[PDB]
Design a binder for this molecule. Structure first.
Ligand code: NAG
Ligand code: NAG
Ligand code: ZN
Lengths: 98, 592
């Protein structure tokens, strides 16, 4: 958006890194220093979630990029998602491989 | 639990907010410049005010992290680049008084007029001092200007100097000069550490090496002016201040028609050749892009061709219309100029494109370090590009000069002289002005001997004499733009030296055999990757290391400068034989 699409958020600070396929949607102030924060932002107490200033005037490295990840799971459970398959001859009066 | 990680996180948050606020402010400024209106101007002012408030608040909150505990060099440098307060050190009363005096001086300089006709600075005074060749026609304007503007700014400048000195002292400094000399202060290892006081000893040393060439050029200019000014020039005297082609004499380029080595072979101008082929602004910019890609530099952004204002807008928009290279951030680089098919603009396009290429280099460094090594480096990377793109060999490669042309000796000498009248003649003036300003801010020159010592130095360094006596009631230093409006002037000397340093350092690595001024870094991928080694650092390392990365030396070097004009140097040394190179500091045009 010309003015700026500030609706897409992203977390910049956190106590420790995440684990494989972990999600965090908490919005508590980052307790950076020893001063225990009291829900207010300021020195050593910053908001973890910031927003993106997506604009059309941006270059190619800061513009919005949509990224999807397809992860395949092969548990011992029977497979239920199998890809496609087919050909088409109902050949008669001739022995063929069916 | 250590303060280092706390400062790291604080700087991370500060940069995250700055890369947004500065971008908004720069975009508002660009919108204001595109269509200059009262609404866009208000938007720009509001954005700038918000950015300044945020920056000063962060600095106030940043001074609580002493650099002694910060161990990582990059983190300490990031914190130091922000802890500096500047003008906020003074009290509200002192700050408001300084702002009032500054704006008063700026308004008095912008609305200055000299009448006995009745013109202003830009409409009549500049053209008159540039083209006029009559003695009085220039003397009257010069005297009127330096007596009106100088005498109106003297009382305000006297208090402005003390206010700036107090401001500097409030910021742990000694004088305003030391504050201005802080940009060249480096920090690092034992070899990459530079001090402010060390510059005073270098700028002078670098000037003693250029004295012979400047003296020869001045003698030649005096001998050539003796003709047009028979009864106003002495064979062994200085040159009047009103016969230098400019109100102050910063650039002697306007003296080329009177000082021409060989008139029967004029300089080379490809404007007509550029018009015959049907070129245009976009074609010039494409040629500049091709040249900058030949050296082996990144490709321009796709937005540089869409969002950039490369040509004058025909939609009725009133633009400032002076060449500028804007780096709004987040991959946004543009160039503002009313580009046309002339040669000077063709070369300025390459000069301004250098600024964009530089901004596209240090984009990886933190926002607190997205700037050139020093004030003299940013402008030195673009000028060297024009020196390589304005040679007789490059114009033939692009197709502006037919192949049947061959480089001549007389025209080469003419071009060398025309370049020296603007590059070699502008160094002594800037050096003398900065020396005077430093000695004034330091209180070494009593306030009762300002103009006296100023004019005494004008004869010893620049070799210029006044056409009429000017006692302490005048203020000529203030009559200059950079002096009235708060701005540093030493950056030009360092820029002029560093451009030649980079030229030689990048031309010797490209295994070029010939005159230093006829170099052509095109078709040389090794000349670009070695240059990017310094453009990618910016302010992340001390300027000494950034310089050594290109030239190898860790300080100013003037030997490459004398090697650029060596042919012209020998020409002047052989032509100035029948005269005394120099000037005696007692001759006076006003005295009989
Ligand atoms: C010129 O300024 C007006 C506001 O006075 C604005 O509406 C218009 O879009 C501007 N022209 C441009 C930027 O093309
Ligand atoms: C660079 O090399 C190309 C290919 O040989 C040539 O066409 C071009 O004219 C050369 N340019 C210069 C600067 O010599
Ligand atoms: Zn410029």
């Amino acid at each position: 958006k010309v003015g700026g699409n500030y609706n897409y958020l992203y977390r910049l600070f956190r106590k420790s890194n995440l684990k494989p396929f972990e999600r965090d949607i908490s919005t508590e102030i980052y307790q950076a220093g020893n001063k225990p924060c009291n829900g207010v932002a300021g020195f050593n107490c910053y908001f973890p979630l910031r927003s993106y200033g997506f604009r059309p005037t941006y270059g190619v490295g800061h513009q919005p990029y949509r990224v999807v990840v397809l992860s395949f799971e092969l548990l011992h459970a029977p497979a239920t998602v199998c890809g496609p398959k087919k050909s088409t001859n109902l050949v008669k009066n001739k022995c063929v491989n069916f | 639990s250590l303060t280092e990680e706390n400062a790291k996180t604080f700087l991370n948050n500060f940069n995250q907010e700055a890369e947004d606020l500065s971008y908004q402010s720069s975009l508002a400024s660009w919108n204001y410049n595109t269509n200059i209106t009262e609404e866009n101007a208000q938007k720009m002012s509001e954005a700038a005010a918000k950015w300044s408030a945020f920056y000063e608040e962060q600095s106030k909150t940043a001074q609580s992290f002493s650099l002694q505990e910060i161990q990582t060099p990059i983190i300490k440098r990031q914190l130091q680049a922000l802890q500096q307060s500047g003008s906020s050190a003074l009290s509200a009363d002192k700050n408001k008084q300084l702002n009032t005096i500054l704006n008063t001086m700026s308004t008095i300089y912008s609305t200055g007029k000299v009448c006995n006709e009745c013109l202003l600075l830009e409409p009549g005074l500049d053209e008159i001092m540039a083209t006029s060749t009559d003695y009085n026609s220039r003397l009257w304007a010069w005297e009127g200007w330096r007596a009106e503007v100088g005498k109106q700014l003297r009382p305000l400048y006297e208090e402005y100097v003390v206010l700036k000195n107090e401001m500097a002292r409030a910021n742990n400094y000694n004088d305003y000069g030391d504050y201005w000399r802080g940009d060249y202060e480096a920090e690092g290892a034992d070899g990459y550490n530079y001090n402010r006081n060390q510059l005073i000893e270098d700028v002078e040393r670098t000037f003693a090496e250029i004295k012979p060439l400047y003296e020869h050029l001045h003698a030649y200019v005096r001998r050539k002016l003796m003709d047009t000014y028979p009864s106003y020039i002495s064979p062994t005297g200085c040159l009047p201040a009103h016969l230098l082609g400019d109100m102050w004499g910063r650039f002697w380029t306007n003296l080329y028609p009177l000082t021409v080595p060989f008139a029967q072979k004029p300089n080379i101008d490809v404007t007509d050749a550029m018009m015959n082929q049907g070129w245009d602004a976009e074609r010039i910019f494409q040629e500049a892009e091709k040249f900058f890609v030949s050296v082996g530099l990144p490709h321009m952004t796709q937005g540089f061709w869409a969002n950039s204002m490369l040509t004058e807008p025909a939609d009725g928009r009133k633009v400032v219309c002076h060449p500028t290279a804007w780096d709004l951030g987040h991959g946004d680089f543009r160039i503002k100029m009313c580009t046309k098919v002339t040669m000077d603009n063709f070369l300025t396009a390459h000069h301004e494109m250098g600024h964009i290429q530089y901004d596209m280099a240090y984009a990886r460094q933190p926002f607190l370090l997205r700037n050139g090594a020093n004030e003299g480096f940013h402008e030195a990377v673009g000028e060297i590009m024009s020196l390589s793109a304005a040679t007789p060999k490059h114009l033939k490669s692009i197709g502006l000069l037919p192949s049947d042309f061959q480089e001549d000796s007389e025209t080469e000498i003419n071009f060398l002289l025309k370049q020296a009248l603007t590059i070699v003649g502008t160094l002594p003036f800037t050096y003398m002005l900065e020396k005077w300003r430093w000695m004034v801010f330091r209180g070494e020159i009593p306030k009762e001997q300002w103009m006296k010592k100023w004019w005494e130095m004008k004869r010893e360094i620049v070799g210029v004499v006044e056409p009429l006596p000017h006692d302490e009631t005048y203020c000529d230093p203030a009559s200059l733009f950079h002096v009235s409006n708060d701005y540093s002037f030493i950056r030009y000397y360092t820029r002029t030296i560093y451009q030649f340093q980079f030229q030689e350092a990048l031309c010797q690595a490209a295994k070029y055999n010939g005159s230093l001024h006829k170099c052509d870094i095109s078709n040389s991928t090794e000349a670009g990757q070695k240059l990017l080694k310094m453009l990618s650092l910016g302010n992340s390392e001390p300027w000494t290391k950034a310089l050594e990365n290109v030239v190898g030396a860790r300080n100013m070097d003037v030997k490459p400068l004398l090697n650029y004009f060596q042919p012209l140097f020998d020409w002047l040394k052989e032509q100035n034989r029948n005269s005394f190179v120099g000037w005696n500091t007692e001759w006076s045009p006003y005295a009989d």
